[model samples]
Target: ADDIVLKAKNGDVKFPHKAHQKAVPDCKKCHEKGPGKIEGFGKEMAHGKGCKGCHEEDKKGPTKCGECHKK
Candidate 1:
């Protein structure tokens, strides 16, 4: 469980798990219930609150194409 890799038709995201852990200590931000993989996580969540939403609000993370999902 080093790098959390997410597969998609457009591309894949090589999530830096440990970095996020350091940046965001609060697990509840992503893990709603407990310390584990989220249930029923899919496109809607990914494109919404999961990744892009925060990125959009924060305005510091990637938003445009070919940034996160490298091909």
Candidate 2:
């Protein structure tokens, strides 16, 4: 599986790509409202933006630092 790097102000973390893609096969799982507008079920899960954001009360997903930053 591919690894995703995440860089933050303090440090970084590495994450699994294939595993993530497999878990979130639906766009409504991350995108708040589709690719163009933020409406419908899309608006429900907007990665820490709308109701079902990233750091919501039930966002038990892989959000490692290296998932975006790797050096």
Candidate 3:
């Protein structure tokens, strides 16, 4: 892991390294390698077919700002 500082609100969020890796079992799980030039996947990783594919309409995972942007 690397010592990193995630600046937020008043201070930082000290992005948890190990915690993050633990949460995301796989990298491609969220960033699927696909061929698309849409909005979310415009020359980048697929978000809809990967992340939003599951985290949409409150299926089971997070799909909100408060999920990460704590209040």
Top candidate on lDDT is 1
Overall local distance difference test of candidate 3 = 0.46
| Candidates ranked by TM-score | 1, 2, 3
**Model 3, which residues run further than 4 Å from truth?**
29-71
lDDT score for residue 71 of model 1: 67
**RMSD of each candidate relative to the true structure:** 2.6, 7.1, 6.8
In the range 1-71, model 2's lDDT, one tens digit per residue, is 46744443444545565765676676565546446543332323333443224434546653443443456
Query: Per-residue CA lDDT of candidate 3, range 1-71, in tens?
Result: 58555344634434345754566677665356565533543212323543344456436554544453443
TM-score of each: 0.76, 0.37, 0.34
Q: Identify the runs in model 2 with alpha carbons over 4 angstroms from their true place.
A: 27-52, 55-59, 62-71
Model 3: how far residue 53 lies from native, Å: 13
* Residue 30, model 3: Cα distance from true site in angstroms: 6.2
lDDT of 3 at 14: 40
Q: How big is the positional error of residue 49 in model 2, measured in Å on the Cα after superposition? A: 4.1
